[PDB]
Structure formats: structure tokens, C-alpha cells
Amino acid sequence: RPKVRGQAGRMNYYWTLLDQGDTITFEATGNLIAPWYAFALNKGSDSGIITSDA
């Protein structure tokens, strides 16, 4: 496949929300990009994203 930013490989990114309690297991034999930090989320609704230059 053609080069982008001088690289011919590609990489895919994934995400998952755990719950409280429940576990998760990674199991790999060739290509893992392991997580190294993660995030614990609060609540409080009605936010968003704004594109502005003010």
C-alpha cells in the first residue's frame, strides 16, 4: 500500500468501557500495542465539542 508520512504499515486503534467489578484479559502472540495509561470517568451531563477561534 502507498506511503503516508513515510510509512507503509498501518495501525488500528480500539477502545472499550469496562464496568465496576468486571475484568479484562489481553492475550497475544504477535502485534499487541498494550495500554499503559487509562482513565476513570465521572458523570455530569450536557457538555460537548466546539470548533471556534475566539
Binding site: 450536557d46 457538555s47 460537548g48 465539542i49 466546539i50
Partner: protein, 174 residues
């Protein structure tokens, strides 16, 4: 519809009158006039205040509304989203403009009705001794001072006090 008073049988307004919307102008033995009618103008202020507050409180405020994002294989849903936003915007702008346009004729006719009723009251409590002359003026065959002026204003005229004496002067002019 148009009740016929404002810019009708009564000519233009009075700049010299300040403290109200509807009032009188009297010329007895010792002065000129421009006194307001605090009874009717208070009812007009109450009606208009309630009207504006009602129009404000029918419209709910909106909460957070932020745009969404779609990739190149979700064109169909993206067009649906745009259709929903444009439809609701058209409906609300229609409602706003139409509400203001109808409310304006309602309020102007309301003022016109108030002026006509305020004229009819004064005519009705001066049945014989007045001789109305044009654009809402009267002319007292008998003699009047400040007390009978206030007596007209409040709505307590007691016509049979003067009913004979006026009659004499009327038969003088006829």
C-alpha cells in the same frame, strides 16, 4: 377591527399630557387642563403586562445542542440529521413571526377600544346638559368649577343637581 377613535373622529394625540395614556382637558373659570384618568390606564397597564409575561413564559429555553460527526459511509443518517434540524428551525421561526404579527393588531385595537369606551362613559353621564361640539368635546350649558370637573372624572356627576338650570340656558339659545 378599528373602533374609530384613534386617528378617527378624534384627531391626533396630546404631547402636553405626560402621566398617563387616557385623559381629559378642561377649561373652567380659572384654568386649563391636561389631567390623566388613572382608573382606566391602570387596567390597560395590567392587561399589557400580563400579555407580555404570558408570551415570554410560553417559550421554553433550550439546553445544550452540539453538532455531531459522521464518516463517509454514514451520509444517509447525516442528511436525516440535517433535515431534522432545519425542519424544527423553520417551524419555530414561523411561530415567532406569526405570533408577533397577530399580537400587534390585537394590542392596537385594545387601545382604540379603551378610548371609545372612555368617551361613551362621559357622554352617558352628561345626557342633556352638554351639547357635544366635535372631536370629543362637550360644553356644559350650566356653569362648572373644579368640583364638578372632578365629579365628572370620578364618575359621580349627580345630574339632577343642575338639570333645571341648564334647561333655562338651553331655551335661551334655542
Amino acid at each position: 377591527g378599528l373602533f374609530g377613535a384613534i386617528a378617527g373622529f378624534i384627531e391626533g394625540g396630546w404631547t402636553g399630557m405626560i402621566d398617563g395614556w387616557y385623559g381629559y382637558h378642561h377649561q373652567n373659570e380659572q384654568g386649563s387642563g391636561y389631567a390623566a384618568d388613572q382608573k382606566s390606564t391602570q387596567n390597560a397597564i395590567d392587561g399589557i403586562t400580563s400579555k407580555v409575561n404570558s408570551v415570554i413564559e410560553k417559550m421554553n429555553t433550550q439546553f445544550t445542542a452540539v453538532g455531531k460527526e459522521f464518516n463517509n459511509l454514514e451520509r444517509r443518517i447525516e442528511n436525516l440529521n440535517k433535515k431534522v434540524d432545519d425542519g424544527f428551525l423553520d417551524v419555530w421561526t414561523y411561530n415567532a413571526e406569526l405570533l408577533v404579527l397577530l399580537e400587534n393588531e390585537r394590542t392596537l385595537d385594545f387601545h382604540d377600544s379603551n378610548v371609545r369606551n372612555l368617551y361613551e362613559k362621559v357622554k352617558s353621564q352628561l345626557r342633556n346638559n352638554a351639547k357635544e361640539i366635535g372631536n370629543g368635546c362637550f360644553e356644559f350649558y350650566h356653569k362648572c368649577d373644579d368640583e364638578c370637573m372632578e365629579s365628572v372624572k370620578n364618575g359621580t356627576y349627580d345630574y339632577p343637581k343642575y338639570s333645571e338650570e341648564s334647561k333655562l340656558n338651553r331655551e335661551e339659545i334655542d
